[PDB]
Each structure stands twice: as structure tokens, then as C-alpha cells.
Design a protein around this ligand. Structure first.
Ligand SMILES: [Mg+2]
Lengths: 76, 145
């Protein structure tokens, strides 16, 4: 009865950590193209001489988002 | 739908990983570049990243797989649905809204916790009116665009 309710509250709280990880990885991926972290003279110059560096950083965050999305789906 | 130079840019990034030029990215080359930037992934984390895009099964990323991954980013149907499902886990009313305070709370206390400056940049990217509520459905539309 009430144990069934506190069980699904415990099966649901197991999703809250992977759900936060997915949101965090999604936001960090999105912020790669707009964050003030990259709005410096250093990154503009770095992005001018070797734009591959920023693309590499984005590729890593995409791979991390994909891993985070799977682990969240594995808690369903 | 990718321009010829847009492909050349992704090829340049792929070549940074693929240092020896054999057309594949292993855990060695993926982790070497990550750690050159100051990151410290574990070997298991590198295997999980590669397995997300390795459609052959040999434990590598080739350029076609890399190109598709870079083109899709988060713009797919499955990403929009699962990110929305993640926000729902922190939606008490089931109304598609979450208070900016509760969003700040979960981001800085669960999982790979966001820094204070990170979550501040996230809250500024969403819009707040009235009771401090953010419409996270329009927030995931912004991220997956
Ligand atoms: Mg190689």
C-alpha cells in the first residue's frame, strides 16, 4: 500500500541524478557556441588561427551528451 | 545539407584526434586530446563515448560516424524528448514549468554540479516572469535548435 508508494518514490529518485547529468551535459554542449567563456580576445584569436580546437571541444561535449542521454534512458 | 567547407572543418577536427592518419579514433587518440586540454577521463568513460558513435563494433570512430555526430549535435527528435523527460523529473506540478530557484538547486547539487557562474549563465538564458517560473519546454527547444 504505502510501501508501494515509497518504493516508486525510491525508483523515481534513482532518475534524478541521471536526469540532472543529462541537463548539465546538454547545457554545457549548448553553451559551447554562446558562453561568455569564449567571448574573449584570446578565444577569438585562438579560433582564428586554429578553429579545430573549438570544434574538438564541441565534439567531446557531444560525445558526453550522448553518454549522458543513454544512462538516463537506462533508468526508465 | 553540409557544405563542402563545413565538411573540411570537421575533417580538421577529426585529424587532430587521428594523429597517425589511419582514419580511426581510438580511446588512445580521444583521451590524448582530452588530456592535452586538461581533462582527465577514465578508460571506461572513453569506451562509453566511442561506443555511442561506433556503428561497426571495432571500438573506433571513423570519419563518416564523426561527421554524422557533429552534424546532428542535439538537433534530433530523440534528444528533444529525453531532455524534456529529464526536466520533467524535477517538475512537481507536471505543468511544464520549474521555478528558477529549484532549477538552480538541482543543477548545483546533483550530478556533474554546475558552478555558480555556469548556472547563472543558464538562468539568464531562460526567461523568468511572475512567480520565477521557467518554461523548460521552450528551454529545450532553444538548446536543440
Ligand atoms: Mg588513428
Amino acid at each position: 500500500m504505502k510501501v508501494q508508494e515509497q518504493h516508486r518514490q525510491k525508483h523515481f529518485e534513482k532518475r534524478r541524478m541521471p536526469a540532472a547529468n543529462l541537463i548539465q551535459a546538454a547545457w554545457r554542449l549548448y553553451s559551447t557556441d554562446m558562453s561568455r567563456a569564449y567571448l574573449t580576445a584570446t578565444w577569438y584569436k585562438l579560433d582564428d588561427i586554429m578553429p579545430a580546437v573549438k570544434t574538438v571541444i564541441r565534439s567531446i561535449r557531444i560525445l558526453k551528451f550522448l553518454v549522458a542521454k543513454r544512462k538516463f534512458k537506462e533508468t526508465l | 545539407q553540409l557544405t563542402e567547407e563545413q565538411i573540411a572543418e570537421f575533417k580538421e577536427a577529426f585529424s587532430l584526434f587521428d594523429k597517425d592518419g589511419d582514419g580511426t579514433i581510438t580511446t588512445k587518440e580521444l583521451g590524448t586530446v582530452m588530456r592535452s586540454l586538461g581533462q582527465n577521463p577514465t578508460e571506461a568513460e572513453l569506451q562509453d563515448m566511442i561506443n555511442e558513435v561506433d556503428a561497426d563494433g571495432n571500438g573506433t570512430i571513423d570519419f563518416p560516424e564523426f561527421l554524422t555526430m557533429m552534424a546532428r549535435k542535439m538537433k534530433d527528435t530523440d534528444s528533444e524528448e529525453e531532455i524534456r523527460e529529464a526536466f520533467r523529473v524535477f517538475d512537481k506540478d507536471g505543468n511544464g514549468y520549474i521555478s528558477a530557484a529549484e532549477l538552480r538547486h538541482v543543477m548545483t547539487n546533483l550530478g556533474e554540479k554546475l558552478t555558480d557562474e555556469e548556472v547563472d549563465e543558464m538562468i539568464r538564458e531562460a526567461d523568468i516572469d511572475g512567480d520565477g517560473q521557467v518554461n523548460y519546454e521552450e528551454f529545450v527547444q532553444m538548446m536543440t535548435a
